[PDB]
């Protein structure tokens, strides 16, 4: 009967489970996590390396930021001491091409006008807008240095980042694997007094490769100067398996690889017919979209993965191998996006067992009610969220004052979780203003943390304590 | 019907919601938070800058505190290297005037008398009292240096601060934008061996301005020496939009600005008639004051905002522009106070939706009981508070011993929350006395943290679990 | 009626409440907490002061510990630069006498015998026992340096401390306010190669005084070398009001001071008659001992406070004023003990209102049951405590391995609270042994932290949820 | 009756309780914990000792790792300054033999093949496999330096460790108590340019001894280079009582020692007969295995303790006393294993009272149901575990990106507890990708931390709240 029907497809759920797992398990062995950090903090948490404390992760001063140029990543991304040309990485990994420096810039004399201080100020700079977007050829002129290029002139898109979240390319440079002039560039950038005053965001980005497990990784770096005059740096990192081709073990992963694409293809159409079979039948059912969420999810990876990847990998052999540098980013961006959703699927992919693990017993029948009576969870979720946002908002306004954790308003929505959990650096909140707001801190941790608790749990308890009688009303 | 009546005013609640939001959203864009810290820790967490560790945030020794004078904020507040006079702020923001140094002092030979140690002690100094308040012209005399001035002789009020919380001006100085003698002052203050021995509180305060978003900010600094001989420093920071006038975007914010003042003006009178309509009708109703709390709240900003601000902004053009320095503080103090309450309103302003969001369903009817049966929350709140204060008190007495987090008795009321939440630095509590009090720590975290839990939650649970039957008794 | 009877004594409870408060409030103003730390970390967290990192709070090496002698507390306890003799404390507080160095030592060749390694080892040293207690006159002989003295030969007792917890005086020295030879002592202690090899505990202790608020404080320092060869340092600090006499404000505190001693004296006898009136009547009543706990508590302070204090304060004028040093310690030890219990009373003193605050309403009647039905709290308290001790024990055994927070078995009973609360430094537990024990960590935080929760709260809930019906059965 | 029967054996449970305790109490006094750390961080958290920050616990660079050779443990394990040869360890403990350096290595040109980059790469190295295991005699040849030995050629086994978890000995060296050439070895290892390029794991291990309490301890050190090119170091530490023989107090511990071996021997057989008496009788009983778990547990220590130990201790006198070094490790490995389980028993040993403590009252009868109705705990434990693993898995995949605490998949199962408890370093999770995944963080701490709570507690509550009526149905 159905025990033949479902377990058969359940077998498909069983085996194909390991398949994508095998891919993830195969494409990524456990050590890949190390391969991030071990390959990271050789740059990030490495100091400025003057025999001075501060790292990249803490940078402040403008000119200090060239002490990042000279003495951090420059000598960070390295040339090796062994003794035609042949350049590896710390004897392990593999460099390719050479980074592509980007930046931003805006029209001078744009905005920020004091009316009567025009004495003191001849010109000013406002924030980086959708209208900022302005292109200064003005020298000192060596070639590129002043050359604007649109980001359609370049190939990939821009970067997202926290505050902006924009697209544009102010200037550009392709770096030099030669350690000689890559500093003399900067020295010629002294000759240019470099590229920045009111510069918002500086991009120096590239990507590289380990030889051993052949895996590939991207270096995307973000240094924001918000228009108020500050310096906020950050990072971006993604690993990559560049070609699904493996010179050795591909046909182990390529074994099941071209297999599943028609496997799920069977899953594709079968419920599509069930869409017009059941239209409102899955409305209000709440067992519906989740099952078919994967459908959208799956194809997204499926469709555009090989579509983009198998395309450009070719020239990646060529535009790379010459000292010139191929942009892999936008491609990688997809891999990221790929990696992202593919994982996000894995959950729902995984939890496909969650419905499968229990057909067994009263156990299986009771969780049906669990969320079915959890409808209330949605009811007072809001009053929390508001009151949650409330303090957060209030926090924003109140604590827009000096404090971290706060007042990039989104982050205040997290730091409003982070507290009820813990870890808070509280010496700052109080020392903001000795009345203000620590009462807040008291209020919230009083109110929320006392009001929030059981309004979960009772509704968890009651109907569940009700499911006992409600499982007693079958007996 | 009422669906026309309320939603119409609800529309007013809807739109006017965004209005004050727009102001806050408009007067403060998100980055203003950075504009605090990015502009702060260039002073606070910056070291003493001798190539020595300690910052301002950690200061201890008396003479070290002049290593704050020379090598911290002095060179902190800066003169720029570009090449008549033209001085900008790190190329971004804008200085104005020059700081006004203040201080305190007390009569010598006042109090602190050992009877038989008068051998060892000729004179002494007690705490800073309401009677301390005493004025030493005694030299070395250059002009101001010994000149007392009352704080009515000066313009603004004093500062609050933690332990004192007083008003007075011991001496005064207007600083120099010239970096030359601003040290030679201190050098002439070496010639005066400066101003301090038993000095309680040293004020060096001022305020400045960003050019870009035109926003304005105040620098209020507090260094307390409590009479026991110690050194406790701190800070005070508030941002400002100085003139509601904007040379560019004012009429965007001035669009709705003069609009709402008569908008809420409609709200003003309408319930005032409802006060004599319903007198005791809102007594015991508990739906009453909160609705009309805003009323007091609103006008406070409303009335005195433009009242004080629009006044003095004029001379702020003049007394500023000469090398002499206008006090903006007391004004700013209001802005703070302004900023403070205006935010505090926003909550209740915000939560005005909290009653509005739910007219919908049984959801709306059940929260009525939520606090209505929460009356018990007030009942055993006290026994906690006492027992809370109890340990805290006990903590005060017990841990008046060396420890932080404790024994400025108010702060012990927080550190009595901070623990049950977490983060405690516990190596100190035990190491106070190996019996004493870690049993306490055990007791509390045992007792409270076991006794406190459900005495919330049951009362949360029960009556709520009772609201089910109590929502079942409508069905 | 009784409303005249109780409130009258309640008035006594009301007023006399503030009395002892006033004492504590009067004897200790809030700033006294600072007066600890501000006066402390000028020694503790101050580095070794070579321009080297480590402080006293972190000391390790034997010889490094003389870098504590020379360059920490020696120059810490200071002589002032102002210009017969006249020496103040940083211009504020007041030194008295000069510290009394103590130490320990044990018989050589006592124990620790490898049988076949007697080749390698001629002599050894075991732990510090009740039988260790052995007295080496052997030189190099200058006078005291080798002179044992019993602690009855000296005046006060010994110190408790963590591992030992013993009494004895190995050697002694009275220090020198002269900063000259106090180092040359140590230099003559180089001439003696100092006093230590297998030395267990080194005591350098003294006490001093602030002039301003006249308050007094004790410096008791502990450096343990456990016999395994390690170095564990620590501190001891207590503040003091030395004479209840105040040269100025005494008669404010001496106002109510001689008042209360006969006040409570009224409380003394009145229930003593009630002891033979009610013998078993207070048995099983559980309202009994707590009320009369204070009785023991009160007199303890009462009796021995002035008994010891008023005695020795006399010679404290004399044995102090000569360059020789009076031991105040044992006296202070009582003050500590005094301070300790007097505070401990204050709780029960305080909570005397806890019964008083509620005679009011059903509120007052329901908490009667609260602990009355809390009898169960004692029932499964044990199973926890065992299982608590269980893991702790298991922790001890398991984690007797390198780790802090653990395996001084008492401390493992705290670190078994500390986790369920939080803050754990967990990188150590796992990295102990990669199986061992992090499963433990999992188990406990699973088991306890899931099993412990509601077994409190249900028993809190149920009977309380039962008190509703049990308060419904009066209605 | 049985009160004579059980309490008699309960007496045996009572007394024999202290016996093994006495052993543990006797074999290990409390201070042994210190004897770990006090003897540890003289190596671990000691810096590289160049007057540079980083310790062993933080090592990164390859060549830096010889700054561990030269300037850390080399001079760490020390030769003493007192004035034939006579070498202590800080006048306290005792060295023996001299460490045995080990390492690993793999075939060159094995794997890691880029197909078209064979231009850039002549040879490569893949991970350390079960097939890696390859033996390079290639020079520069001095004797051992290139000599492979199997681990059966050596005596003990290999080490477990985190990622590998393997067995093999690449090369070997016996160190020198002479501090002269032990560096010149390394200098001759400069002459050999040492032993490493693609080296996975470097073992330098040994064990030593305190003279005082005669206790013994093992030094097992692990430095992994995973094949991606990174550097992860670590430690291993176990204390030891080497011979149960004590030159002094043995016959105190040897008093009860040969006593219990026949004591439990009585316990051995008595239930063995009860196995065939009751076969399925203990099936489903759930009171069964736990009681007899100790049985397996006990003998494991019992059997192999003296079996291995009493054997090799002999030659430990000899192969030690010559400058050559006996391997004690494998022996110690058992001690560890011994120490481990013996402790693990102690729990169940301890909790033997847990059944014994309560025969008393209704208290004793109610906990019977506690787990008896806890059967549900197993029911939704899974849905958690999955959903637990789910996010963890998702975490792995998502956060295989740079982060700690994560993506050695096992560790993500802990860091999935660690959060709900607390302490998280959260600045990394968000800053991974600003969308990705902090929503996750939100989700989990929302979902789990709200969904997990009462699904414990209700099931704890309900049936317990049911045990009241279920204890009311006896009355
Ligand atoms: N007040 C914000 C919009 C409201 C509309 C009602 C629902 C909630 C959101 C508005 O200030 C957003 C902004 O100014 O950017
Ligand atoms: N005992 C304090 C006053 C009491 C009165 C009763 C109610 C509680 C407060 C008093 O010590 C306050 C002070 O000394 O500053
Ligand atoms: C361009 O760079 C060269 C150095 O490579 C320098 O000599 C020259 O002056 C620069 N010219 C401009 C316009 O920057
Ligand atoms: C070798 O390096 C030089 C400069 O370092 C570079 O210009 C050249 O392109 C490299 N050779 C090859 C074949 O890539
Ligand atoms: C005042 O200051 C000047 C230096 O500007 C110094 O020469 C003079 O001695 C000072 N006089 C007094 C009374 O301080
Ligand atoms: C220029 O600087 C001098 C000293 O630094 C100052 O006195 C002067 O007022 C400044 N010029 C103007 C126009 O403010
Ligand atoms: C005693 O100390 C003096 C220095 O004050 C020194 O010269 C003398 O040798 C010492 N003698 C002994 C026995 O220590
Ligand atoms: C002054 O100091 C010396 C040494 O520093 C000391 O011996 C003397 O007793 C001090 N004077 C008085 C009056 O105590
Ligand atoms: C062996 O070591 C010695 C130094 O002890 C050195 O002189 C010799 O060259 C080395 N030979 C080899 C093959 O390593
Ligand atoms: C003394 O040291 C040398 C080298 O340090 C060593 O070879 C010798 O064996 C040692 N002496 C004894 C007796 O072990
Ligand atoms: Ca918690
Ligand atoms: Ca119930």
Coordinates of N, CA and C and ligand atoms in Angstrom, one line a residue, chain A residues 393, chain B residues 14-15 17-26 350 353, ligand 1:
Chain A
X393 N 13.3 51.7 19.0 CA 13.1 53.0 18.5 C 13.6 54.0 19.5
Chain B
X14 N -2.2 58.1 12.2 CA -1.4 57.5 11.2 C -0.4 58.5 10.6
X15 N -0.9 59.5 10.0 CA 0.0 60.5 9.3 C 0.9 61.2 10.2
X17 N 1.9 60.5 12.9 CA 3.0 59.6 13.3 C 4.2 59.8 12.5
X18 N 4.1 59.7 11.2 CA 5.3 59.9 10.4 C 5.9 61.3 10.5
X19 N 5.1 62.3 10.8 CA 5.5 63.6 10.9 C 6.7 63.8 11.9
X20 N 6.4 63.6 13.2 CA 7.4 63.6 14.2 C 8.5 62.6 13.8
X21 N 8.2 61.4 13.4 CA 9.2 60.5 12.8 C 10.0 61.2 11.8
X22 N 9.3 61.8 10.8 CA 10.0 62.5 9.7 C 11.0 63.6 10.3
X23 N 10.5 64.3 11.3 CA 11.4 65.2 12.0 C 12.6 64.5 12.5
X24 N 12.4 63.6 13.4 CA 13.5 62.7 13.9 C 14.2 62.0 12.7
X25 N 13.5 61.4 11.8 CA 14.1 60.9 10.6 C 14.9 61.9 9.9
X26 N 14.2 63.1 9.7 CA 14.9 64.2 9.0 C 15.9 64.9 9.8
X350 N 4.4 56.4 19.9 CA 4.3 55.2 19.1 C 3.2 54.3 19.6
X353 N -0.5 53.5 18.5 CA -1.0 52.4 17.7 C -1.3 51.2 18.5
Ligands
LIG1 N1 7.1 56.9 10.4 C1 7.7 56.1 9.4 C2 6.7 55.4 8.5 C3 5.7 54.7 9.3 C4 4.3 54.7 8.7 C5 3.3 53.9 9.5 C6 3.7 52.5 9.7 C7 5.1 52.4 10.3 C8 6.1 53.2 9.5 C9 8.6 57.0 8.5 O1 9.2 58.0 9.4 C10 9.8 56.2 7.9 C11 10.9 57.2 7.5 O2 10.7 58.4 7.8 O3 11.9 56.8 6.9

